[PDB]
């Protein structure tokens, strides 16, 4: 499940840079009103450096 | 445990009371407030502050330090045998014999 993938420790994950997926994740993780641990810990991993 | 919150205090009946509230709503709705918060509580974390599960270890072999109590019991046995052997080393003179 994505609840696993966004939180599991072993496997790094990401997508195509600047893509509408990358932006879809950013727009969920840094959302003002959606605030879930899930999309946040997605974006923290994805946005590294 | 939300809905508690911080705010500017003013004297009773101050003519500014509605003016600052009006401006604070505009800042809250323009997004101008969100910038300052991202500035001061950035999520560009130099470390992960939130995953409490340290990643590398999920069980692990025993080691000298976790085992050390048994070595300490053995060392106590050694030292007690030394104390006994030194008492014997003195007393066997009085025994004059094996």
UniProtKB/Swiss-Prot annotation, chain A:
Superkingdom in the source lineage: Eukaryota
Locations listed in the record: Postsynaptic cell membrane
Glycosylation sites: 47
Quaternary structure (record): Tetramer; dimer of dimers. Interacts with EML2, MAGI2 (via PDZ domains) and AP4M1. Interacts with BECN1, GOPC, GRID2IP, SHANK1 and SHANK2. Interacts with CBLN2, but not with CBLN4. Interacts with CBLN1 (via C1q domain); the interaction is CBLN1-NRX1 complex formation-dependent; CBLN1-binding is calcium-independent; CBLN1 hexamers anchor GRID2 N-terminal domain dimers to monomeric NRXN1 isoform beta; promotes synaptogenesis and mediates the D-Serine-dependent long term depression signals and AMPA receptor endocytosis.
The protein's role, per its UniProt record: Member of the ionotropic glutamate receptor family, which plays a crucial role in synaptic organization and signal transduction in the central nervous system. Although it shares structural features with ionotropic glutamate receptors, does not bind glutamate as a primary ligand. Promotes synaptogenesis and mediates the D-Serine-dependent long term depression signals and AMPA receptor endocytosis of cerebellar parallel fiber-Purkinje cell (PF-PC) synapses through the NRX1B-CBLN1-GRID2 triad complex.
Family membership: Belongs to the glutamate-gated ion channel (TC 1.A.10.1) family. GRID2 subfamily.
UniProt note: domains: The PDZ-binding motif mediates interaction with GOPC.
Disease in which the protein is involved: Spinocerebellar ataxia, autosomal recessive, 18: A form of spinocerebellar ataxia, a clinically and genetically heterogeneous group of cerebellar disorders. Patients show progressive incoordination of gait and often poor coordination of hands, speech and eye movements, due to degeneration of the cerebellum with variable involvement of the brainstem and spinal cord. SCAR18 features include progressive cerebellar atrophy, delayed psychomotor development, severely impaired gait, ocular movement abnormalities, and intellectual disability.
Name assigned to this protein: Glutamate receptor ionotropic, delta-2
Organism: Homo sapiens
């Amino acid at each position: 499940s994505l609840q696993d993938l966004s939180k599991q420790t072993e496997i790094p994950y990401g997508t195509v840079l600047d893509s509408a997926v990358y932006e879809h994740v950013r727009m969920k993780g840094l959302n003002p009103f959606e605030r879930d641990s899930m999309y946040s810990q997605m974006w923290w991993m994805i946005n590294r450096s | 445990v939300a809905d508690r919150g911080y705010g500017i205090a003013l004297q009773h009946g101050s003519p500014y009371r509605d003016v600052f509230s009006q401006r604070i709503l505009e800042l809250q709705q323009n997004g101008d407030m969100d910038i300052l918060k991202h500035k001061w509580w950035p999520k560009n974390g130099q470390c992960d502050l939130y995953s409490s599960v340290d990643t590398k270890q999920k069980g692990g072999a025993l080691d000298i330090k976790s085992f050390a109590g048994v070595f300490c019991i053995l060392a106590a046995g050694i030292v007690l045998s030394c104390f006994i052997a030194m008492l014997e080393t003195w007393w066997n003179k009085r025994k004059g014999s094996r």
